[PDB]
């Protein structure tokens, strides 16, 4: 229970590797092609007029389980601002995921815009910059430019008594390893991160699961 932030905040820091990429690209998927070893996802979300998140998440394989497993540090949020005066609406509405090579870390970053809607009908932006780096030795694909198309709805648990948040999103992206070979079927997902928001400490656990072939993703997520 008792999430200091809101929960549509938390939603992008909390898979990639389960978008759809359609055969016309299945050379351009990093994400799936870092498995099983898997990828070290870092952003810095910037919430205009307002604070920022920084995020690093290990995102890999154990066994038969993808997991995401991140560090969230909050920073800089005023106290009556939209994100810890609580005045976000759970509707948001995000800009594709923009992404490029990234030559350097043998990965890709990635850039996008999500809208906040806000209680008094103004917009709370959060700015986000991605990178990601491969864990593992073995060949990932370095793509060309190109974008995801995201697409969520957040929702409730009528027998859950923990404070929690239901999540369906759909995924698609558009413009060797054999890592994508662990994703033919359905991928039971856990997620698991520890945050820090302007000193106060939090945890949030998901689990779920992932099937890429339609770029389904179903989680429940409860704080703790």
Same mark, same amino acid.
């Given at each position: ?39 070290? /996802? ?22 038969? %389980? ?57 917009? /709370? ?5 991605? /990178? ?19 697409? %969520? ?24 390893? /054999? ?46």
């Amino acid at each position: 229970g008792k999430l200091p932030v809101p929960w549509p905040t938390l939603v992008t820091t909390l898979v990639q590797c389960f978008s759809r990429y359609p055969d016309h690209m299945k050379r351009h998927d990093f994400f799936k092609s870092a498995m099983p070893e898997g990828y070290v /996802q870092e952003r810095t979300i910037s919430f205009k007029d307002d604070g920022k998140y920084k995020t690093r998440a290990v995102v890999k394989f154990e066994g038969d %389980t993808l997991v995401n497993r991140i560090e969230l540090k909050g920073t800089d949020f005023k106290e009556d601002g939209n994100i810890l005066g609580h005045k976000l609406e759970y509707n948001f509405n995000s800009d594709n995921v923009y992404i490029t090579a990234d030559k350097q870390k043998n990965g890709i970053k990635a850039n996008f815009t999500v809208r906040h809607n806000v209680e008094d009908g103004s917009v /709370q932006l959060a700015d986000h910059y991605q /990178q990601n780096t491969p864990i593992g030795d073995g060949p990932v694909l370095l793509p060309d430019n190109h974008y995801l198309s995201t697409q %969520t709805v957040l929702s409730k648990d009528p027998n859950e008594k923990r404070d929690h948040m239901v999540l369906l999103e759909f995924v698609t992206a558009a413009g060797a390893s /054999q890592g994508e070979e662990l994703f033919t079927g359905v991928v039971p997902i856990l997620v698991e991160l520890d945050g820090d928001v302007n000193g106060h400490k939090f945890s949030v656990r998901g689990e779920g699961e992932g099937d890429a072939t339609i770029g389904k993703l179903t989680l429940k997520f409860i704080s703790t």
